[PDB]
């Protein structure tokens, strides 16, 4: 209720050039060149039309992508307010390509059987299946990658909410893909943050952020009567937090797939790295920290940049959220801006 130091609040509690712009330009006439010498329902309708008034009186920090998919893989309801959705593209190549780009000594028939088998396990018509969730990868590779039961706690989450078959079928696909030189990347690009699903039966319409900040979305305590919002890594198993040594800078968020090429029999590792390095410096630090280079070709990891967390500090690690009965180390990331980035792995 008013301050002592007035000048700082008129700007805080709250153009004239555009007013002056039309003033010389538009106010001026015939220039240029010169010559010498109905209680509630009614209220609602009126407001919708009016809303079209204000929004049509004017006119960028947000982008929404929207898509319809099935609930076979993925599943919006199990997931929450802040979640990574990864797209999956063109099931048509049941290893059709396996024919090529597959080195000899490879039974390229593995994918077609692994994958077609996946379909039997879980036709084309009304919709297609895209949108793999971040969650569903953590469980599929849970037993594959390094930490178990912090990792398997995520697997308990998906079997009880999202089927262990599909996880196992999809894991067989990841093994078969990493086998034949068709990788999980060059598939599964980043899609968004999962604003609102709107599902019906086996169908889902998923809105999610193409890019822009997350926290500024549907917001509220939670989006709709669900819970809060966050980009919680979902693993104390994922959220490899680099910058063991660090100085304040905007943390960055990348997506890395680590593989095993007969060292472990086509290992799939999927996690997120959070440190301040611009992609030209991440390839170096990815060379270190990794002994997965086993030739036992030489293409160990492939990474794309999700975006920025233009504040270092929100990196909460919580093994504390329920997506049904199951509990998961959950790391909360406070504030995120999404830069989709591109996939770079040459080596």
């Amino acid at each position: 209720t008013k301050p002592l130091p007035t000048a700082p609040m008129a700007w805080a509690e709250s153009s004239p050039r555009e007013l002056a712009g039309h003033a010389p330009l538009r106010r001026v006439l015939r220039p240029p060149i010169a010559r010498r010498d109905t209680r509630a329902t009614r209220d609602d309708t009126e407001q919708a039309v009016d809303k079209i008034l204000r929004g049509a009186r004017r006119a960028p920090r947000y982008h929404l992508t929207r898509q319809v998919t099935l609930t076979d893989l993925c599943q919006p309801n199990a997931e929450r307010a802040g979640a990574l959705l990864l797209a999956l593209r063109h099931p048509t190549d049941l290893p059709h390509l396996a024919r090529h780009r597959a080195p000899p000594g490879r039974q390229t028939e593995r994918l077609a059987e692994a994958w077609g088998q996946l379909l039997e396990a879980s036709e084309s018509g009304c919709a297609r299946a895209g949108l793999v969730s971040f969650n569903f990868l953590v469980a599929a590779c849970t037993a594959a990658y390094d930490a178990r039961d912090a990792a398997e706690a995520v697997r308990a989450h998906i079997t009880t909410n999202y089927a262990g078959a599909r996880l196992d079928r999809f894991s067989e696909c990841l093994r078969a893909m990493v086998h034949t030189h068709v990788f999980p990347h060059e598939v599964m690009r980043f899609f968004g943050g999962l604003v609102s699903w709107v599902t019906q039966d086996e169908l889902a319409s998923v809105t999610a952020v193409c890019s822009g900040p997350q926290e500024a979305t549907h917001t509220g305590h939670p989006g709709r009567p669900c819970s809060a919002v966050t980009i919680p890594a979902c693993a104390f198993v994922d959220l490899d937090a680099e910058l063991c040594l660090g100085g304040p800078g905007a943390a960055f968020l990348y997506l890395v797939f680590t593989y095993r090429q007969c060292r472990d029999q086509e290992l799939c590792c999927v996690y997120v790295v959070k440190s301040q390095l611009p992609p030209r410096g991440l390839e170096a630090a990815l060379e270190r920290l990794f002994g997965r280079l086993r030739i036992t070709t030489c293409t160990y990891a492939a990474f794309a940049e999700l975006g920025v967390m233009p504040d270092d500090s929100p990196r909460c690690l919580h093994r504390t959220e329920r997506f049904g009965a199951v509990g998961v180390p959950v790391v909360i990331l406070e504030g995120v801006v999404w830069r989709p980035g591109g996939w770079r792995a040459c080596a």
Binding site: T38, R39, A40, T41
Partner: protein, 47 residues
């Protein structure tokens, strides 16, 4: 057929007001006509 015409009507409206708001925040619960439903329970034990 009887009449080709008839005597229909318009809309009924529910709103949270007064002690419905106050129970929709600090609590998160609401009941239709909590005013009378509430004061028929208070009357009831006052006799």
């Amino acid at each position: 057929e009887d009449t080709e015409a008839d005597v229909p009507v318009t809309y009924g409206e529910m709103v949270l007001n007064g002690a419905n708001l106050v129970t929709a925040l600090v609590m998160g619960k609401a009941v239709r006509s909590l005013d009378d439903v509430g004061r028929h329970l208070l009357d009831m034990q006052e006799e």
